[PDB]
RNA sequence: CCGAGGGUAGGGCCCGUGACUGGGGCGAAGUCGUAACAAGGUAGCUGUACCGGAAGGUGCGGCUGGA
RNA sequence: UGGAGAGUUUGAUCCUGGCUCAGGGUGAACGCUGGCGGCGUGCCUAAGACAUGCAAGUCGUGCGGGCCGCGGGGUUUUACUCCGUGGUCAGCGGCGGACGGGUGAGUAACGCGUGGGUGACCUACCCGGAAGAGGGGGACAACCCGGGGAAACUCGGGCUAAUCCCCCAUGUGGACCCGCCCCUUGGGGUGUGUCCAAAGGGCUUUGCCCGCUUCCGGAUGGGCCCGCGUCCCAUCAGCUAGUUGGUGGGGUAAUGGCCCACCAAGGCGACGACGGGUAGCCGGUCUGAGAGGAUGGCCGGCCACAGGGGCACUGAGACACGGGCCCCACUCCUACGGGAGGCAGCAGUUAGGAAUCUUCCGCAAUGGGCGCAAGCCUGACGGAGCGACGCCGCUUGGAGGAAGAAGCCCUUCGGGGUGUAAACUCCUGAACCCGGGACGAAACCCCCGACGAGGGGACUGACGGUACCGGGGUAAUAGCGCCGGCCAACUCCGUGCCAGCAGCCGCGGUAAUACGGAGGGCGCGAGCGUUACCCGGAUUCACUGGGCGUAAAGGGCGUGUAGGCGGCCUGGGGCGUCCCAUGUGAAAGACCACGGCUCAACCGUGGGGGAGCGUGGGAUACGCUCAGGCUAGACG
């Protein structure tokens, strides 16, 4: 079975490519707390109807390009902009951790 | 001091000289076929394609090429000859291209 | 290995006549009945207050030097006994009394465990047909510790079993003086055993 | 080829071969594919050779060349018989 | 065309070393004061500034782990 | 079936708190001592350099020859030796050199682990089945002739054969463009077109065997990809410009920026990017009560490397340990034009080191290659040797034996101690002596059978005349540490803050149970000690399992971004969670039974966990989120 991963897209601003943000959660191997370590996967969707804010599913596909090793499968939500703003502020947290 | 893998060294130089001759003939018949079909020619530019196709499938019959590399050679030669004869070709007397 | 030699010195030093010499330790010249105080230039002085380590070490020595086991052989027996499922001391004592030299001593082919050690090491004793030259040879429950043909007519085994004509071997053992053999029936316990050893202190010695 | 062969185990002068299926490439005690049987070449137990005859027949069905002695230890287990 | 390697020029990081010097530890019952702990013989400590062989002093303020 | 504490801050106590110690362990080393045997195990550093031998070959049943040894005339001498071949010596050709073996340098990564994907693939040899193998040629070594070169070798001319290469046809089939449905990211079915095969050899002959071609499926071996785990440093905070994406190509077996053109500004980053240090990873191993910490030796899997670096060729697979080419470093030959090398194979030498061995025997076994088979090769391996390096086993005697010798050490002068310890009495007899002496090995082969299954046959042991067994036979190595407490075991003498001890506390200044010696004792014993390293103690990084007033520790305080956490009733989902059968969790180890070596170490079998992770179903309290509501929180 191919890997099937839910996630919310956070970037679509390439050609034929969306960037989906899978947020897996798993117990700590030592302390056992449930933690949400996210991860950003590039995806492929040449019809390009998944704008910045949609929530898609992702199938493990043959490599479309280097790092672009996934495909969009299906939409399960419209614009979840309140979830994409979490990451879109989490990126903007990084100008202040400079020197 | 020596070993008689030197027989294999002098076999490999021979086989290099003996399959380079049926490897570079592929590339130059490819260039002739692509160029003559690019300049609006005809059956005169498909006889070159059947020539290169016979050369490829005679190359794959030994150790010069895989079957799969032979198929890729032909699938990126004669595909290009067909989309190059798209440009006002009309192969009435057409050889390797299947109508 | 055998530690050597002087053994009524260890009949002393722990205050209990753990019999090692044999008929000497039964006869009135044990030098433990004669002098119960430990060997040494001080010896018969005030008892130094036995520490918590000291009492466990003395009684672990009471368990060891009865059987004459070298310490790492003893400790490997213990770390087999702890893995072996059972009441740990009361399987450890049965494992100690299931050595071939100790089964030959309890069977009375020899007046002492060190004489029984010479008997089994010099190829006299047979276990289940053929001779076994090992004092550390365990005896499974239900096998016949016998005397072979080259040692059946021995004067030592003859005098030993002469002494054992009518003696009482254990309920986990048997005896046969007409064929000079004995079935090791089962393993013994401390309720079966005449040990001057609280086994529990030996168990507590090894979680140091 | 996927050979059935006798991968050695056991101490010095304590040979205990293990009739097993490996590739023809791997070393003697390599990662095998299936232990089809064991063979003490000393018969120190009464049950010194045991072979799973069904999986031996399967590995012969998908192509195997059991070697000069694995042929012997399958014949003495009754694998090449037709019944 | 790419190309290991060599060169040139300039970067970054790390290390050895460098006259001398700033401190630091640590010696032998050194010299020099007596700062602290007793209301340490000016209550102490700390911020900071200035000064002073030196502990330190004083100013402004705080604190009480001072009355 | 699982958990020990102690010494030390002070006059004394309690606390916090650190240091130290008893324990186990090792690729060990070092000191003293050292008898045997088995099993393992042995250059951790210079992945520094290598003498010497071997470590990779093999096939006349693929082919043509040179070469010598049995039989000799097509002619009135072998003598175009053609033959029947009988081997060696190369050569062509095929297969194997890509496995086996070695090492830890590199690599912080899809490398590894682990679970999947390969509608994006290969897979020689092997196996199932299909369909066959008809005609032609050709040069290329050997060889001969000639030349060059010191040598390495190299070149020119002429041959010549084959399972060498090429051409033509047959095309079951397969490939490719689209003849189009269908599976639905890039297929067997398809259809015209186009392209493509092939090889013979031995033999009892109007026979099989060994080969061969193409294709489909298998099995194994992989390639590549992805989720997840993968050290330390934030006093490394920004990094990246083929970087990120597209399109069109090129290459690859295949996806991919794997590489190239054009366009687009992207990709990554406090969930630690980038940079630096270190490091092979894992099964495991050690430790631990367990969680966890450490580690990756031997054995097994995988990657990487083969003097450093790059590169392709050949081939199924290599970007190749013992193939090539180049640069660089080094060595060696040179007649100075160039050559040759590659021990991180086994053994070995040197060098560094505290330290790590034999230039051993053998393919008898198992494995690997070639061969139809005999056979050949195999420093893989099977064994042996060396080294207490570890584990395990064994011996150095046993039974007597004195109110207790001598010697020695104390002594209160009475004696006590060494101590049944000794001598001696028996008697058992390791080593040693003699004879027998393997299991390790019945396969290959030969025959019946059928040129299968089954029956019968023989030959074949390095270890090794070893183990073991049968007989005889000598009483026949014990040392090392420690004795103030922790820590078991104490007196005397010599020493006099000296000499020295030490792990911490500390002893040592003239009565030292702490130093040096003797006696005695304790511990362990062919070992005992020391060192280094690791874990435990260390609940001293605290998840189980710590704290923060004064002991080390509250941020100066607020607002607040990320985050983390979240009131009550309701309902679905089933994401966390939990459950159930599986799939994997390799073997080896660990664990448990039960067996074989005289036991044990080891080793064999069986069984069970086995965290995880995928898959399918179920559970719905709790965590989740979407929907609905409430008012106890919060705000107005
Ligand atoms: Mg692309
Ligand atoms: Mg005696
Ligand atoms: Mg314990
Ligand atoms: Mg001075
Ligand atoms: Mg003075
Ligand atoms: Mg003052
Ligand atoms: Mg003062
Ligand atoms: Mg004052
Ligand atoms: Mg004042
Ligand atoms: Mg004051
Ligand atoms: Mg000044
Ligand atoms: Mg001051
Ligand atoms: Mg002033
Ligand atoms: Mg001030
Ligand atoms: Mg105290
Ligand atoms: Mg103090
Ligand atoms: Mg105290
Ligand atoms: Mg504390
Ligand atoms: Mg412990
Ligand atoms: Mg040593
Ligand atoms: Mg070596
Ligand atoms: Mg070296
Ligand atoms: Mg080297
Ligand atoms: Mg040789
Ligand atoms: Mg050849
Ligand atoms: Mg043949
Ligand atoms: Mg090795
Ligand atoms: Mg590395
Ligand atoms: Mg990094
Ligand atoms: Mg890095
Ligand atoms: Mg990774
Ligand atoms: Mg995998
Ligand atoms: Mg081939
Ligand atoms: Mg010539
Ligand atoms: Mg044809
Ligand atoms: Mg032909
Ligand atoms: Mg696979
Ligand atoms: Mg290829
Ligand atoms: Mg492609
Ligand atoms: Mg790239
Ligand atoms: Mg680096
Ligand atoms: Mg690791
Ligand atoms: Mg612990
Ligand atoms: Mg680990
Ligand atoms: Mg290995
Ligand atoms: Mg390299
Ligand atoms: Mg090199
Ligand atoms: Mg290289
Ligand atoms: Mg190739
Ligand atoms: Mg090679
Ligand atoms: Mg290799
Ligand atoms: Mg190469
Ligand atoms: Mg010259
Ligand atoms: Mg010159
Ligand atoms: Mg030359
Ligand atoms: Mg080499
Ligand atoms: Mg073989
Ligand atoms: Mg060997
Ligand atoms: Mg040894
Ligand atoms: Mg004696
Ligand atoms: Mg005397
Ligand atoms: Mg005798
Ligand atoms: Mg005698
Ligand atoms: Mg035989
Ligand atoms: Mg053979
Ligand atoms: Mg037969
Ligand atoms: Mg033969
Ligand atoms: Mg004898
Ligand atoms: Mg004591
Ligand atoms: Mg002096
Ligand atoms: Mg000392
Ligand atoms: Mg004096
Ligand atoms: Mg004195
Ligand atoms: Mg002393
Ligand atoms: Mg520690
Ligand atoms: Mg801990
Ligand atoms: Mg906690
Ligand atoms: Mg404080
Ligand atoms: Mg404080
Ligand atoms: Mg504070
Ligand atoms: Mg601050
Ligand atoms: Mg505050
Ligand atoms: Mg707030
Ligand atoms: Mg929030
Ligand atoms: Mg759930
Ligand atoms: Mg299962
Ligand atoms: Mg297992
Ligand atoms: Mg037995
Ligand atoms: Mg075993
Ligand atoms: Mg087993
Ligand atoms: Mg779990
Ligand atoms: Zn006694």
From Swiss-Prot, chain A:
Q: How does it assemble?
A: Part of the 30S ribosomal subunit. Contacts protein S12.
Annotated Gene Ontology cellular component terms? cytosolic small ribosomal subunit
Task: Specify the protein name.
Answer: Small ribosomal subunit protein uS17
Task: Please provide, alphabetically and separated by semicolons, the GO molecular function terms listed in this UniProt record.
Answer: rRNA binding; structural constituent of ribosome
The phenotype of cells or organisms lacking this gene is: Increased generation time and a temperature-sensitive phenotype.
Q: Which CDD domains match?
A: Ribosomal_uS17 (cd00364)
Entry function: One of the primary rRNA binding proteins, it binds directly to 16S rRNA where it helps nucleate assembly of the platform and body of the 30S subunit by bringing together and stabilizing interactions between several different RNA helices. The combined cluster of proteins S8, S12 and S17 appears to hold together the shoulder and platform of the 30S subunit.
> What family does the entry list?
Belongs to the universal ribosomal protein uS17 family.
What domain of life?
Bacteria
UniProtKB/Swiss-Prot annotation, chain B:
Q: How does it assemble?
A: Part of the 30S ribosomal subunit.
Q: Name one Pfam family in it.
A: Ribosomal_S20p
Q: Which UniProt keywords apply?
A: Ribonucleoprotein, Ribosomal protein, RNA-binding, rRNA-binding
Gene Ontology CC annotations of this record: small ribosomal subunit
Tell me the Gene Ontology biological-process terms attached to this UniProt entry.
translation
Similarity-based family: Belongs to the bacterial ribosomal protein bS20 family.
Organism, scientific name: Thermus thermophilus (strain ATCC 27634 / DSM 579 / HB8)
Protein name per the record: Small ribosomal subunit protein bS20
**Record carries keyword Transferase:** no
- Annotated region (Disordered) at 1-25
Q: What does this protein do?
A: One of the primary rRNA binding proteins, it binds directly to 16S rRNA where it nucleates assembly of the bottom of the body of the 30S subunit, by binding to several RNA helices of the 16S rRNA.
Which PANTHER family does the annotation name? 30S RIBOSOMAL PROTEIN S20 (PTHR33398), SMALL RIBOSOMAL SUBUNIT PROTEIN BS20C (PTHR33398:SF1)
Q: Does the keyword Transcription regulation apply?
A: no
Organism lineage:
Bacteria, Thermotogati, Deinococcota, Deinococci, Thermales
> What are this entry's molecular-function GO terms?
small ribosomal subunit rRNA binding; structural constituent of ribosome
Swiss-Prot record, chain C:
Q: What is this protein called?
A: Small ribosomal subunit protein uS4
Q: Which residues form the S4 RNA-binding domain?
A: 98-160
Alphabetical list of PANTHER family matching this protein: 30S 40S RIBOSOMAL PROTEIN, SMALL RIBOSOMAL SUBUNIT PROTEIN US4M
State the protein's purpose.
One of the primary rRNA binding proteins, it binds directly to 16S rRNA where it helps nucleate assembly of the body and platform of the 30S subunit. Binds mRNA in the 70S ribosome, positioning it for translation.
**The gene coding this protein:** rpsD
> Subunit comment for this entry?
Part of the 30S ribosomal subunit. Contacts protein S5. The interaction surface between S4 and S5 is involved in control of translational fidelity.
Cofactor(s) required, per the database record:
Zn(2+); [4Fe-4S] cluster
User: What are the protein's GO molecular function terms?
Assistant: metal ion binding; rRNA binding; structural constituent of ribosome
Originating species? Thermus thermophilus (strain ATCC 27634 / DSM 579 / HB8)
Which GO cellular component terms, listed alphabetically, does the Swiss-Prot or TrEMBL entry include? small ribosomal subunit
Q: Which InterPro entries match?
A: Ribosomal_uS4, Ribosomal_uS4_bac-type, Ribosomal_uS4_CS, Ribosomal_uS4_N, S4_RNA-bd, S4_RNA-bd_sf
Curated annotation (Swiss-Prot), chain D:
* Lineage of the organism: Bacteria, Thermotogati, Deinococcota, Deinococci, Thermales
Q: What does this protein do?
A: Binds to the lower part of the body of the 30S subunit, where it stabilizes two of its domains.
Ribosomal protein is among the record's keywords? yes
Primary gene name? rpsP
InterPro entries found in the cross-reference section: Ribosomal_bS16, Ribosomal_bS16_dom_sf
Q: Which UniProt keywords apply?
A: Ribonucleoprotein, Ribosomal protein
Stretches of the chain forming a coiled coil according to its record:
none
Query: Is the keyword Membrane in the record?
Result: no
**Which GO terms label this protein's molecular function in UniProt?**
structural constituent of ribosome
Per the record, the similarity remark reads: Belongs to the bacterial ribosomal protein bS16 family.
**What's the superkingdom here?**
Bacteria
Q: Which organism is it from?
A: Thermus thermophilus (strain ATCC 27634 / DSM 579 / HB8)
The name this protein goes by in its record:
Small ribosomal subunit protein bS16
């Amino acid at each position: 079975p191919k890997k099937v991963l839910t996630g919310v897209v956070v970037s679509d601003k390439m050609q034929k490519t969306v960037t989906v943000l899978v947020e897996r959660q798993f117990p700590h191997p030592l302390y056992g707390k449930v933690i949400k370590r996210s991860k950003k996967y590039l995806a492929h969707d040449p019809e390009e109807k998944y704008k910045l804010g949609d929530v898609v599913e992702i199938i493990e596909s043959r490599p479309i390009s280097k790092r672009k090793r996934f495909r969009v499968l299906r939409l399960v939500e419209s614009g979840r902009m309140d979830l994409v703003e979490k990451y879109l502020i989490r990126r903007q947290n990084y100008e202040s951790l400079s020197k | 001091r020596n070993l008689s893998a030197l027989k294999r060294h002098r076999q490999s130089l021979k086989r290099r000289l003996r399959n380079k001759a049926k490897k570079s003939a592929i590339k130059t018949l490819s260039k002739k076929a692509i160029q003559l079909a690019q300049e609006g020619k005809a059956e005169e530019a498909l006889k070159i394609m059947r020539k290169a196709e016979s050369l490829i499938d005679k190359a794959a019959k030994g150790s010069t090429l895989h079957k799969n590399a032979a198929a890729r050679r032909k699938s990126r030669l004669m595909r290009k000859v067909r989309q190059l004869l798209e440009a006002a070709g009309a192969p009435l007397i057409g050889g390797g291209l299947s109508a | 290995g055998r530690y050597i030699g002087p053994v009524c010195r260890l009949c002393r030093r722990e205050g209990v006549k753990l019999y090692l010499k044999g008929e000497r330790c039964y006869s009135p010249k044990c030098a433990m009945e004669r002098r119960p105080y430990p060997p040494g230039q001080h010896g018969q002085k005030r008892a130094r207050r036995p520490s918590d380590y000291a009492v466990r070490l003395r009684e672990k020595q009471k368990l060891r030097r009865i059987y004459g086991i070298s310490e790492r052989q003893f400790r490997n027996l213990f770390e087999e006994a702890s893995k072996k499922k059972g009441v740990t001391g009361s399987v450890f004592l049965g494992l100690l009394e299931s050595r071939l030299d100790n089964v030959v001593y309890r069977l009375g082919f020899a007046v002492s465990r060190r004489q029984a050690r010479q008997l089994v090491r010099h190829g006299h004793i047979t276990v289940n047909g053929r001779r076994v030259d090992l004092p550390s040879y365990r005896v499974r429950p239900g096998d016949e510790i016998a005397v072979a043909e080259k040692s059946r007519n021995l004067e030592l085994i003859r005098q030993n079993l002469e002494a054992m004509k009518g003696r009482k071997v254990g309920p986990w053992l048997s005896l046969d003086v007409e064929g000079m053999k004995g079935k090791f029936l089962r393993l013994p316990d401390r309720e079966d055993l005449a040990l001057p050893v609280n086994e529990q202190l030996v168990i507590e010695f090894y979680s140091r | 080829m996927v050979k059935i062969r006798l991968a050695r185990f056991g101490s010095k002068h304590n040979p205990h071969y293990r009739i097993v299926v490996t590739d023809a490439r791997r070393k003697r005690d390599g990662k095998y594919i299936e232990k089809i049987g064991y063979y003490d070449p000393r018969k120190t137990t009464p049950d010194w050779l045991k072979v799973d005859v069904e999986r031996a027949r399967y590995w012969l069905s998908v192509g195997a060349q059991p070697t000069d002695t694995a042929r012997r230890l399958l014949r003495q287990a009754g694998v090449f018989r037709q019944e």
